[PDB]
Amino acid sequence: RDSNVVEPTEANGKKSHVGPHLGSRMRIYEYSIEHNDAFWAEIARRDFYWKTTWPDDQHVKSYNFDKSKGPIFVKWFEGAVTNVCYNALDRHLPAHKDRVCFYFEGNDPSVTEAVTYGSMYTRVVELANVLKYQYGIAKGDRVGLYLPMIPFAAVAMLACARIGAVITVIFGGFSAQALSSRLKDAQTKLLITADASARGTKPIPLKDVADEALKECEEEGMSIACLVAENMSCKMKEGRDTWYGDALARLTPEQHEECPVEWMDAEDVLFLLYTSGSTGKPKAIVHTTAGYMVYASTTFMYSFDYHMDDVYFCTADIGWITGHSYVVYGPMIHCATSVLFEGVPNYPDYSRWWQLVEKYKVSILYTAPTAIRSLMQAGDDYVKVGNRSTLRVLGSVGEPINVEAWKWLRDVGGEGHCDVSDTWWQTETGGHMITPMPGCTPMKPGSATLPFFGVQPVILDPMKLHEKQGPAEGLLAIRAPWPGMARTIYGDHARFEKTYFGVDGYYMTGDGARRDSDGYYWITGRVDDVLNVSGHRIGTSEIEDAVNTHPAVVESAVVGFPHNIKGEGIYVFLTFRQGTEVTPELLAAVKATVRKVIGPLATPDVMQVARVGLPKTRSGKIVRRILRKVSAGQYTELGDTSTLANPDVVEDLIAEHQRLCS
Numbered sequence: 001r002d003s004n005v006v007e008p009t010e011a012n013g014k015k016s017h018v019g020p021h022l023g024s025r026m027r028i029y030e031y032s033i034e035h036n037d038a039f040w041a042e043i044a045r046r047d048f049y050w051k052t053t054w055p056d057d058q059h060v061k062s063y064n065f066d067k068s069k070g071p072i073f074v075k076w077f078e079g080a081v082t083n084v085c086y087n088a089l090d091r092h093l094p095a096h097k098d099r100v101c102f103y104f105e106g107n108d109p110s111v112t113e114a115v116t117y118g119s120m121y122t123r124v125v126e127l128a129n130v131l132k133y134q135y136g137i138a139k140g141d142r143v144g145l146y147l148p149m150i151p152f153a154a155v156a157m158l159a160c161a162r163i164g165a166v167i168t169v170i171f172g173g174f175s176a177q178a179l180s181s182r183l184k185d186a187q188t189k190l191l192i193t194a195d196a197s198a199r200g201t202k203p204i205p206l207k208d209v210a211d212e213a214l215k216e217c218e219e220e221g222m223s224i225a226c227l228v229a230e231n232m233s234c235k236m237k238e239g240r241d242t243w244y245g246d247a248l249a250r251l252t253p254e255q256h257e258e259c260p261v262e263w264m265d266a267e268d269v270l271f272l273l274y275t276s277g278s279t280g281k282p283k284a285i286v287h288t289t290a291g292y293m294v295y296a297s298t299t300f301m302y303s304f305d306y307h308m309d310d311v312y313f314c315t316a317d318i319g320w321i322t323g324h325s326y327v328v329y330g331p332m333i334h335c336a337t338s339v340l341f342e343g344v345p346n347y348p349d350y351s352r353w354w355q356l357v358e359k360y361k362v363s364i365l366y367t368a369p370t371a372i373r374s375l376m377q378a379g380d381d382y383v384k385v386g387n388r389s390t391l392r393v394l395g396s397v398g399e400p401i402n403v404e405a406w407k408w409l410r411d412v413g414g415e416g417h418c419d420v421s422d423t424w425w426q427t428e429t430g431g432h433m434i435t436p437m438p439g440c441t442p443m444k445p446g447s448a449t450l451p452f453f454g455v456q457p458v459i460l461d462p463m464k465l466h467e468k469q470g471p472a473e474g475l476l477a478i479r480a481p482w483p484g485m486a487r488t489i490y491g492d493h494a495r496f497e498k499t500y501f502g503v504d505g506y507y508m509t510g511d512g513a514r515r516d517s518d519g520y521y522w523i524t525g526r527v528d529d530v531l532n533v534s535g536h537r538i539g540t541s542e543i544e545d546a547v548n549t550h551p552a553v554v555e556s557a558v559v560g561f562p563h564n565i566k567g568e569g570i571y572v573f574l575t576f577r578q579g580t581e582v583t584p585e586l587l588a589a590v591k592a593t594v595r596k597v598i599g600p601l602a603t604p605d606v607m608q609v610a611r612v613g614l615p616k617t618r619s620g621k622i623v624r625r626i627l628r629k630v631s632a633g634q635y636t637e638l639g640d641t642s643t644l645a646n647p648d649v650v651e652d653l654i655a656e657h658q659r660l661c662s
């Protein structure tokens with residue numbers, strides 16, 4: 001056995017749904033691959049409600065991964081009928097009406113509410129009836145959500161699922177321009193938002209931002225209604241904007257108690273989630289109903305070993321896939337009791353998440369390496385004042401975790417009595433794909449370990465594009481379908497086939513990985529050109545285009561660079577027009593332009609002025625390798641300069657970088 005292996009705790013072994021040692025997991029995994037249809041049919045029948053089941057347990061999937069045979073497609077549970085809201089809520093009643101669904105706390109610690117499953121039912125039937133009868137939302141209509149992490153956010157997702165509407169969630173940190181682009185592309189009929197929120201000391205205007213987005217949408221010929229939850233005096237446009245309290249007042253008494261369920265076919269769309277690509281504008285990843293429901297919920301259960309006596313806390317936002325699968329849908333479908341937190345880990349101070357852990361007796365904590373590294377920098381006293389005795393599983397998602405952060409998470413945060421589930425997956429996969437399972441999986445810090453049940457990863461040789469056996473490094477791909485796979489890109493199946501199915505027979509993840517002699521996977525990062533910043537994808541061209549809209553800017557080039565907290569940061573090289581007075585204020589104005597066009601999440605970390613221009617070939621192409629190496633401080637590895645039309649720029653780029661140090 002490797003010396004870096006960490007054994008699962010004995011207590012987690014005894015509690016595990018799977019078993020106390022690796023053989024228990026491998027027995028199920030083998031069955032889940034060789035009897036793949038029967039496995040998922042048994043899971044689906046065991047753990048979910050179906051109005052109508054699929055016709056044949058031996059054939060719950062049909063698919064084509066080989067473009068030479070025809071269009072790429074995937075279907076799971078075709079013929080079955082179900083509803084995600086019913087599985088998240090109604091079926092838990094009346095037996096669990098008094099069970100807490102969310103222990104909610106606001107940014108302000110004096111704002112708290114324990115929301116039971118019974119109360120969620122009431123809230124969801126009310127909102128669903130508002131949507132049906134006051135907004136005329138019908139099956140398949142698109143509804144945009146621009147909401148903070150408050151109970152109404154989950155209510156809104158589940159109410160739309162209840163009636164068969166398609167949600168598209170826009171992260172609350174996007175700007176108005178980013179919000180409007182998503183509403184226009186999805187052709188939303190309705191925007192659900194809130195008056196405002198707060199994050200630390202920062203006010204978060206939501207309806208004020210939505211006002212600017214809706215004005216742009218109207219200029220484009222759209223008519224989008226807006227429903228505003230009361231979270232914290234807004235301007236309300238007569239005829240377009242309604243306070244949720246006024247909408248509630250229009251309900252009849254029985255509309256507070258009953259709302260018919262729209263029974264959905266298996267491949268009906270559930271949500272669109274706009275995701276940045278290596279090239280081009282963000283595209284909406286499409287997830288349908290039955291396969292996603294099954295996959296998000298089953299991975300929730302096994303990857304975290306969730307039992308009914310556990311209390312769960314995921315720190316992710318609903319604006320991202322982790323918040324879809326592992327705050328709202330997956331946890332509620334398995335009747336989890338969860339912490340729902342509107343705020344940030346450092347307000348009032350850096351003990352906040354630990355205050356939540358101890359107050360609600362959290363036993364499973366799912367967070368991200370950027371956040372962990374921030375907690376590490378703040379100092380261990382903020383952690384050690386908290387009682388962490390209830391923690392038994394800690395999870396990490398979104399980006400690689402290095403050994404030091406992994407060890408700190410387990411041995412400081414979790415006091416050495418936790419297993420750690422480093423879950424590798426992506427927006428397109430619906431749920432966890434490679435992950436430890438508590439109690440049964442020996443862990444290697446920095447490795448995602450073994451594939452989830454029903455998942456067959458492969459390592460493809462980058463040059464020959466065929467599978468490599470045994471220990472190997474190359475392109476991470478998946479050789480067979482799983483229930484949670486995204487079904488298309490909204491309005492662009494051609495781009496979906498091009499991006500993910502360029503090698504016939506495989507789903508191409510866009511990640512590189514190494515598989516070791518124990519079959520454990522080590523994800524080494526994106527092999528395309530998209531950035532993964534604080535755990536979320538952003539494309540360089542989006543940031544460049546935004547930077548270039550500043551009137552003084554001639555040209556820009558954006559690269560990622562290693563960042564000790566965010567993993568990968570945003571480094572901008574740019575040129576200004578002749579005669580520009582370059583000042584700190586001007587650089588701040590260019591940064592503010594990015595923040596207006598995209599949002600704070602896209603704030604450049606470093607802005608370097610290329611006094612003499614960007615390195616370009618004689619054909620005018622920017623030589624990005626040079627900028628990548630400079631931004632990382634790797635001056636000895638710039639590589640070839642002989643194709644540069646302007647080789648005198650290199651000396652300046654290095655000297656300016658050293659002055660900034662970056």
Ligand SMILES: Nc1ncnc2c1ncn2[C@@H]1O[C@H](COP(=O)(O)O)[C@@H](O)[C@H]1O
Pocket residue numbers: 275321396397398399400401422423424425426427428448509510511523525526532535536537
């Ligand atoms: N556990 C992990 N380890 C390493 N990289 C990860 C992990 N989880 C997510 N990622 C990265 O995040 C990408 C998905 O980003 P996104 O879907 O935009 O949030 C993946 O393709 C990986 O590059």
